[PDB]
Amino acid sequence: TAIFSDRYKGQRVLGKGSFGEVILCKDKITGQECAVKVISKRQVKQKTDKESLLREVQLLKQLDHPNIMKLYEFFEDKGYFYLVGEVYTGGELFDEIISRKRFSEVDAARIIRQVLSGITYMHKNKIVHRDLKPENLLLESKSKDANIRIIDFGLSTHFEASKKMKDKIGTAYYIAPEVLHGTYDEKCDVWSTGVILYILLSGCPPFNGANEYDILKKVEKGKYTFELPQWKKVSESAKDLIRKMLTYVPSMRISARDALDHEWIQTYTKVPSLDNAILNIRQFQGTQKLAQAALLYMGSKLTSQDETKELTAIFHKMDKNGDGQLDRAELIEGYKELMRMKGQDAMLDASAVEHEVDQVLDAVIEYSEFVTVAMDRKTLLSRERLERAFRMFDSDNSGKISSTELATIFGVSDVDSETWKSVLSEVDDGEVDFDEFQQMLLKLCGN
Ligand SMILES: NCCNc1cc(-c2ccnc(Nc3cccc(Cl)c3)n2)ccn1
Ligand SMILES: [Ca+2]
């Protein structure tokens, strides 16, 4: 079997996916850039056997559609699966919609026509997504209007979904009811697209709640309404397509193919701006991103504390003199031992570790000072994301967030109401600043 590291080298971390981290890699010969999703075998269980996974991979490598991410290669070692595909720099669909000033049904129809084209094509080839959500809709290029590429098509069938809340943020809104009860088919992707279409034209999820379970209850009942002021300026054909896409019984629900032939798609692809919808998508995107940043900040604080004591124990055993000092070569041997114990970090090969240790050695010799800098390079990346997400959420630049906004944020993060309210009283008038918010998250993860 071919080795991944011998062909590719890690350049930069693009982001965190559903089943693992996504790394920007470069071919060592041709120089071609690629986005590699690294799935850890220990953190992700396989729903299918080895031969069923290789057959789907082989089929996915031969598929080609302008609204589907291209899977180029597939590698596997003792503890990881590497899914190598094309790179896209346009960002997530909803991040582009919150930046523009005007957004109409013509833009919404042009978006959904692309999503339905990719889905129709993948359904004809017997591939189901199941976890279709705005985060999986990436724009091919950095433009106001760009080509949409759907990511992670077919992975759900072969990999078990994470139970960790940091990986489940913004999934409950889009999941089809039949997926929750076990019996589902490709029609679950039409439902998910119907939910995204509902959010594009109103900025509010059709099935909403104060927490993950309340949302899943609404989805399971399957009842929703077009009873919000913003729906008065939307066409009846757009409402008709949503009704056909959000039909409870999958056999009665419209197909992805028939959804392209619908009057709304045919009329609006061949109109007033929805201002209320843009404001609500801005608020929605800002709320989802602060909740994720909060969960990733708490996770990074626990991860750094685990690695701080582990790396201190590794350096203490290597220190023979007991003076507390080590050589540059010894620090590398200890850092390589940390990845040898917890597994390869998504730090692909030994060359990335020597440079990562050199970057710390240049900044910071006592190994106590090296431990602080080495570990702060991981925490300050998540803390900068937290402050940036807080600043973005704080759209009126008041410097604070209300108690109602905290309840909404902690609701999306799935932190019980009595737990955060108690933690606020320990640190701190119905509102908190960034430092107070950060202090609440630290107290919510044993600090
Ligand atoms: N079908 C192969 C699945 N691999 C895959 C590829 C990508 C993937 C594909 C293209 N670009 C980027 N960059 C990126 C990553 C996170 C956030 C943002 Cl806004 C961009 N990731 C994301 C998730 N999974
Ligand atoms: Ca504010």
- Give the integer Cα–Cα distance in Å for 184 and 188: 7
**Same structural domain for residues 252 and 114?**
yes
Q: What is the distance in A from the centroid of ligand 2 to the CA of 283?
A: 12
125, 141, 160 — which closes off a domain?
A: 160
Quickly tell me which residue has 């790396």 as its tokens: 311
- CA distance linking residue 369 with residue 359, whole number of Å: 14
The residue type of 63 is L
**CA 412 to ligand 1 center in whole angstroms:** 23
d(CA 100, CA 285): 14
| Ligand 2 centroid – CA 408 distance (Å) | 14
Q: Is 187 helix (H, G, I), strand (E, B) or coil?
A: coil
* Residues constituting the chain: 447
Can you give the three-state secondary structure of 265-322, one letter per residue? HHHHHCCCECHHHHHHHHHHHHHHHHHHHHHHHHHHHHHHHHHHHHHHHHHHHHCCCC
Same domain, 104 and 54: no
Q: Please state whether beta strands 400-402 and 431-433 pair in parallel, antiparallel, or not at all (unpaired).
A: antiparallel
Q: Of ligand 1's atoms, which has the minimum distance to the CA of residue 14? A: 15
Residue 49 lies in domain: 1-89+153-160
Per DSSP, 233 falls in state G
| Active site (annotated) includes residue 27 | no
Round to whole Å and give the CA distance between 380 and 134.
27
User: Pick from 164, 174, 180: which is nearest to 197 by CA?
Assistant: 174
CA distance 99 to 282: 9
Q: Are 173 and 204 in contact (CB under 8 A)?
A: no
Same-domain status, 377 and 242: no
The number of the ligand 1 atom at minimal distance from the alpha carbon of 69 is 1
- Which tokens in the block code for residue 186? 């490709």
For residue 120, the tally of other CB atoms under 10 A from its CB is: 20
Closest by Cα among 344, 336, 381, 354 to 82: 344
Residue located nearest, by CA, to atom 5 of ligand 1:
37
Q: Please check whether residue 208 is in contact with residue 218, taking contact to mean a CB–CB distance below 8 angstroms.
A: yes
Nearest residue by C-alpha to atom 19 in ligand 1? 91
Tokens of 428: 């701190």
Q: Which of the listed residues 12, 13, 14 should we mutate to test ligand 1's pocket, taking the one with most ligand atoms within 8 A of CB?
A: 14
- Smallest CA-to-CA distance from 4 within 71, 67, 81, 60 is with 81
Is-contact 39 20, C-beta < 8 A? yes
Query: How many whole angstroms separate alpha carbon 214 and alpha carbon 232?
Result: 27
Contact 264, 241 (CB under 8 A): yes
Give the ranges where 319-346 is alpha helix by DSSP (H). 328-342
How many domains does the chain divide into?
3
**Number of C-alpha atoms within 13 angstroms, CB side, residue 8?**
27
Q: Tell me how far the alpha carbon of residue 36 lies from the centroid of ligand 2, in angstroms.
A: 38
Task: Specify the DSSP class assigned to residue 57.
Answer: H
Whether 383 and 274 have beta carbons less than 8 Å apart is answered as no
Please answer whether residues 402 and 431 qualify as being in contact, where contact means their C-beta atoms are separated by less than 8 angstroms.
yes
Q: What does residue 443 show for φ and ψ, rounded to 5 degrees?
A: -65, -30
Pairwise CA distance, residues 333 & 353, whole Å = 10
Cα R_g (the chain), whole angstroms = 24
Catalytic residue among 6, 49, 64, 131: 131
Whether residues 180 and 122 fall in one domain: yes
Closest atom of ligand 1 to 91 CA is: 19
Question: How far apart, in whole angstroms, are the C-alpha atoms of residue 348 and residue 417?
Answer: 40
Are the C-beta atoms of 151 and 192 separated by less than 8 Å? Answer: no
User: For residue 284, how far is its CA from the centre of ligand 2 (angstroms)?
Assistant: 15
Best of 68, 69, 80 for a ligand 1 pocket test (most atoms within 8 Å of beta carbon) = 69
CA pair distance 409, 286, nearest whole angstrom: 10
Q: How many beta carbons lie within 10 A of that of residue 284, not counting itself?
A: 21
Among residues 57, 110, 55, which one has the least CA distance to residue 81? 57
Both 120 and 61 in one domain: the answer is: no
Distance CA 292, CA 92 (A): 15
Ligand 1 atom at shortest distance from the alpha carbon of 87: 10
- State which of 112, 137, 160 marks the end of a domain: 160
| Burial classification of residue 400, based on how many CB atoms lie within 10 Å of its CB (0-12 exposed, 13-18 middle, 19 or more buried) | middle
Q: Report the alpha-carbon distance of residue 137 to residue 111 in Å, rounded.
A: 10
Residues 6+ apart with CB under 8 A from 88: 35, 69, 138, 139, 140, 141, 149
The sign one gets for the Cα dihedral 203, 151, 26, 31 is negative
Count CB neighbours of 145 within 10 A: 11
Task: Give the single-character DSSP code of 229.
Answer: G
Whether residues 121 and 171 fall in one domain: yes
348 phi and psi, to 5 degrees?
A: -75, -40
| Residue 113 and residue 235 in one domain | yes
Decide: helix, strand or coil at residue 447.
coil
Residue 41 has what DSSP assignment? T
Atom 17, ligand 1: residue with shortest CA distance? 15
Query: How far is the C-alpha of 174 from the C-alpha of 172, rounded, in Å?
Result: 6
3-state per-residue secondary structure call for 74-121? EEECCCEEEEEECCCCCCEHHHHHHHCCCCEHHHHHHHHHHHHHHHHH
Give the ligand 1 atom nearest the CA of 84.
2
Expressed in angstroms, the distance from the first to the final Cα of the chain is 45
The answer on whether 394 is annotated among ligand-binding residues is yes
Specify whether 404 is located in the same domain as 263.
no
Please give the Cα distance from 431 to 423 (Å, whole number): 13
C-alpha closest to that of 109 among 217, 249, 264, 263: 264
- CA 446, CA 310: separation in Å to the nearest integer? 18
Determination technique for this entry = X-ray
H or E element in which residue 148 lies: strand 148-150
Domain boundary among 106, 134, 160: 160
Asked if 72 contacts 86 with a C-beta cutoff of 8 angstroms, the reply is yes
Exposed e or buried b for every residue in 233-252, given b needs 16+ CB within 10 A? bbbebbeebbebbbbeebee
* Shared-domain flag, residues 327 and 349: yes
Return the CATH number at 247. Answer: 1.10.510.10
Give residues (CB < 6 A) around ligand 1. Answer: 14-15, 17, 22, 35, 37, 69, 71, 83, 85, 87-88, 91-92, 138, 151-152
Phi, psi of 223 (to 5 degrees): -90, 140
H-helix or E-strand spanning residue 71: strand 71-76
C-alpha of residue 395 to centroid of ligand 2, in Å: 6
Question: Residue 108: which of 251, 264, 1 has the closest Cα?
Answer: 264
Asked whether residue 123 falls in the same domain as residue 133, the answer is yes
Question: Do 270 and 318 have their domain in common?
Answer: no
Which value, to the nearest 10 degrees, does the dihedral of the CA atoms of residues 349, 353, 359, 364 take? 170
Helix 328-342 / helix 367-393 crossing angle, nearest 10 deg: 60
Q: Calculate ∠ Cα 38-340-2, nearest 5°.
A: 45
Consecutive H or E run containing 362 = helix 350-363
Breaks (C-N over 2.5 A) in the chain follow: 270, 346, 364, 428
Which residues are CB-neighbours of 59 under 8 A, at least 6 positions away?
125, 127
CB environment 2-37: b (16+ within 10 A), e (fewer): eebbebbebeeebeebbbbbbbbbbeeeeeeebbbb
Phi, psi of 433, deg, nearest 5: -90, 180
398 is in an annotated binding site: yes
Note whether 311 and 417 are within 8 A (CB). Answer: no
For residue 27, say whether it is annotated as part of any ligand binding site: no
Regarding whether 130 and 85 lie in a shared domain, the answer is no
Residue 323 has which token pair? 């003076």
Inter-axis angle of helices 403-413 and 275-318, nearest 10:
60
How many other C-beta atoms can be found within 10 angstroms of the C-beta atom of residue 165? 17
The CATH code of the domain that includes 65 is 3.30.200.20
Identity of the residue numbered 410: F
Query: Is 95 marked as a binding-site residue?
Result: no
Question: What secondary structure letter does DSSP report for 256?
Answer: H
**Resolution reading in Å:** 2.3
